[PDB]
Amino acid sequence: KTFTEVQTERLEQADRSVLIKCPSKLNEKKLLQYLSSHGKIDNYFFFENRGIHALIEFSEKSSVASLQAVTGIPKAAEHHVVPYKSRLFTFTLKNPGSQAAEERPVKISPQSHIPVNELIPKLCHADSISSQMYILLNEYQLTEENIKLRYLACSLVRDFARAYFPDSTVKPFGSSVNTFGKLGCDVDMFLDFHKKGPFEMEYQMKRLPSERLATQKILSIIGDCLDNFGPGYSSVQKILNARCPLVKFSHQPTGFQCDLSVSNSIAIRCSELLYIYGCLDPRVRALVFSLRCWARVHGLTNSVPGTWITNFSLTMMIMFFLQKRSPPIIPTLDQLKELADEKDKHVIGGYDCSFVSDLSKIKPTKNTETLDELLCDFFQYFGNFDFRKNSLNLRKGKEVNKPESSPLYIWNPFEQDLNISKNVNQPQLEKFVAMARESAWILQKEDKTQQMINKEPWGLAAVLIPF
Amino acid sequence: KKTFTEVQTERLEQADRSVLIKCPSKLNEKKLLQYLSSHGKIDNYFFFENRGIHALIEFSEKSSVASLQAVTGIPKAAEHHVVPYKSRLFTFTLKNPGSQAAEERPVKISPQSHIPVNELIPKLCHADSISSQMYILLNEYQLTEENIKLRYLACSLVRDFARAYFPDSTVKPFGSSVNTFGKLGCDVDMFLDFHKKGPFEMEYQMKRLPSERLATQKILSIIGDCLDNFGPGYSSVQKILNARCPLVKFSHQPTGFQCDLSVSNSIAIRCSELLYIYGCLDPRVRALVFSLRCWARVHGLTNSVPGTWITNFSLTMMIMFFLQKRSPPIIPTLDQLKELADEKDKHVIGGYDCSFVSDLSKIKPTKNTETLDELLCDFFQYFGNFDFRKNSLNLRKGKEVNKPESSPLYIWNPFEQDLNISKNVNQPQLEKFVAMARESAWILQKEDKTQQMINKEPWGLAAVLIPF
Ligand SMILES: Nc1ncnc2c1ncn2[C@@H]1O[C@H](COP(=O)(O)OP(=O)(O)OP(O)(O)=S)[C@@H](O)[C@H]1O
Ligand SMILES: Nc1ncnc2c1ncn2[C@@H]1O[C@H](COP(=O)(O)OP(=O)(O)OP(O)(O)=S)[C@@H](O)[C@H]1O
Ligand SMILES: [Mg+2]
């Protein structure tokens, strides 16, 4: 069960899935009975998105074509649609006024988490801090249904990209696949491209200077195509001049906000690294989900980029913390490099990104610290950390001198000599520290039993309300 | 024979299953065709010069293209410094250049441009009569079979981009490229065209378009950008989306053509078929057009760039009007062709009637036996004495009529009948046309042909194809 195996399997399942906008009067049994005539159905679910929608995952890829064969084109008076045929369908009843199976009803798989004000009560009603964090983790994490929906979005963009580039693939990365994803987070997608006789035979293709110019031209054209031809695509925004060129859009059927970029093979290795750490111990994920929520409540993070610390930066700080335990909760990257082999030996653009993929090759942690300790110690550790003189190196798992002058310096573990938190200024760092120290204080000085009895917030709940 | 539409469909189908291969410097024809034959049967092929030897290959089967593509790789210059759009443009090089092991036979190069005027004049002087001069010109200038395949292929390559999101699209050529009056070196005018199970009514989700002009502009804009950036070989891509008929101009380096891509001129296609019929009816028709069009170019009456000049197309219609006014007429009128049409040939587009026969046998041949010697001189005489102030040219009736609007030269658009196809022409350019017509008539009347032949001087067509 390696990261890459899972990706391939998830993509193959997304390959043979479809989305159906369901009728207002919905008969589950009749719908599945009909669709079963096109082939076996491995899995399905329903979700709410300006009407009831259904994801259908067939056992066979041929069932998609079968269904497409009996699907027609919409036909209006103005009658002007872009006739791109996808795997987005709309089912309506032939005779709507002759059907009265109104009270089914249908199980709706949620795609967003409960808001904080609903979550706080549940945390107060828990037994310990450790449980508060796991409750949060469970309300927030990606469900199996949401994950299928994400890979499908990639798959739909793949087919759309395959109009001009038939050998293309679109693989997700970042929070969507590194185990640290929460409901409502964006889908980060990257576009990838993959002898008898006397002649070497090649295509004629325009020779541009660098990857960068091609990348920009491709994304620009795909962008325009999504905007003008793509069904359910919207708010298309081209950001082709960033360090990593990128196109943003919202996909109405799945409801996701999406980021399409090209060939970032580094970010994939990073996604696998965080995948490993997330799989090694359940405390890792529990801790990240809570601290990331904490940062949002106190305005340390923000939706728009700027001087704020990013979830990703924060996540790496949390990993560094976990590397510095006695004994360490997770191994260092260098430790993972020494356990790698030739199969796991990836070198990309000069940098070494090699590390083990097999989980059993990693010796489990002897550490038995509870989350009560780890949460408070996180605030204590970074509330007393010397950010002027020290930087966070996740390869060595040690504090080291800063290569460059920067308020918060965190070492990019692959593209070394980059600071993943270069964007952070001193005002935002000082606010992080102040909130850390205040949160530590609250957790230390709180009389938990007294707060429970008084029907007041305590533990995680106390640090997840504004000060 | 066959009908205009049948030919188009057949030509496009053949272009559908053709490819262009940039050949090695050391070219072994036999070995190349032997290898390509392993991917399927080859109906036709030829070679042409264009910054190196290129080859058009027309397979019998469309599957042979995919077969060939399957064994074709990516160049890999810098490890993704190319745009990986895969087309039907290939580059063949030798695996081991040091293993050539056969005798070097040279290769037949099919020309794609005609000889220049200064080379043509001698050939015309050495001919027997004026009639022959015109047929010699016609033969040096007309489209070859190879050039025609190359034109339809260019359309086919442009089609492939458009079908990415409009799968039922066609890019069909029109104008001189297909109306029999095309000459080597003329541009390619292209237009883009778009044409009970269960208890559930099942439909695709598909993005709505805006109304025709805005869609057209968005589509051409995107195809334009694709030609420019996904390539290969497109160049000088120029978007002119705000014209009365939105349009994208470009030059295609592999085929060597200058191209005009627009959307849905179904009228201009009917016009192209009309001229096709006239061109097929009698060989004198084409002979006359090719000579007069050449005449106009030599005397600066026409020009490459649009403006106040008479256009080849306008001139061509004037020539058709002339031929309608013969005794007996050399070609039938459009109304005559409308009366011979049936339901199959009954085309009505945007309010206007564009119906006319497609079958050639339904048209009775012409009794007219006038030679080209007469027709050429009579053309100059007729229009040199024509009253352009009081008369307009109506090709439907085949008659001179009053001008609906005030315009120096008024020629009736035979389909969109509110319109003057030569509205662009001012009085200075019309007066120059008339002056050149009258002077050309005079030269042909007063020339002593035998005296000019003996003196090694220009005569007949050659005399009117040198500047005054
Ligand atoms: N400053 C950065 N330095 C190195 N890698 C980065 C940086 N920013 C983003 N990435 C990579 O791009 C991926 C996706 O970017 P983001 O969507 O912004 O972050 P995320 O990890 O998906 O968490 P979310 O979306 O805020 S829940 C990250 O996981 C990184 O692997
Ligand atoms: N003013 C016009 N009115 C009507 N149809 C026109 C007009 N101009 C061009 N067309 C159509 O467009 C076609 C091609 O346009 P042009 O390229 O300008 O003419 P052409 O017939 O191709 O002659 P060439 O290309 O100069 S050798 C013509 O056959 C006409 O069918
Ligand atoms: Mg993300």
Residue numbers in the entry:
A (entry chain B): 52 to 245, 255 to 527
B (entry chain A): 51 to 245, 255 to 527
What does the paper say about this structure?
In mitochondria, mRNAs are polyadenylated by mtPAP. In our work, we purified an active form of chicken mtPAP and determined the crystal structures of the mature wild-type (WT) enzyme (residues 37–568) alone and in complex with ATPγS, UTP, GTP and CTP substrates to 1.82–3.1 Å resolution. The purified mtPAP crystallized as a dimer as observed in solution. mtPAP consisted of an N-terminal domain (NTD: 52–194 aa) and (using the domain nomenclature of the DNA Pol β family) of palm (195–341 aa) and fingers (342–527 aa) domains. The palm domain is composed of three α-helices (α6–α8) and a mixed five-stranded β-sheet core (β5–β6–β8–β9–β10) that forms one wall of the active site and harbors the catalytic triad conserved in all members of the Pol β family: D237, located at the base of β6; D239 on strand β6; and D319, which belongs to β10.
The tails formed are composed almost exclusively of adenosine residues and to gain comprehensive understanding of mtPAP's ATP specificity, we determined the crystal structure of mtPAP complexed with the non-hydrolyzable ATP analog ATPγS in the presence of Mg2+. The two hook-and-loop regions of Lα3–β4 and Iβ6–α7 that form a part of the dimerization interface and that are resolved on one side of the Apo dimer were disordered in the ATPγS complex structure. The ATPγS electron density was well defined. ATP is primarily recognized through its triphosphate moiety by residues from the palm and fingers domains. The ribose moiety is sandwiched between the aromatic side chains of F372 and F224, which are highly conserved among mtPAPs. N6 of the adenine ring donates a hydrogen bond to the main-chain carbonyl group of I480, with the interatomic distance being 3.3 Å. We observed density for a second adenine ring from ATPγS that was stacked ∼4 Å from the primary ATPγS bound in the active site. This second ring takes the position of an aligned incoming 3′ RNA base. Intriguingly, the Mg2+ coordination is distinct in the two protomers: in Mol-B, Mg2+ is coordinated by the carboxyl groups of the conserved residues D237 and D239, whereas in Mol-A, the side chain of D237 is flipped away 6 Å from the Mg2+. In our crystallographic model, the N472 lies within ∼3.9 Å (Mol-A) to 4.2 Å (Mol-B) from the N1 atom of ATP's adenine moiety.
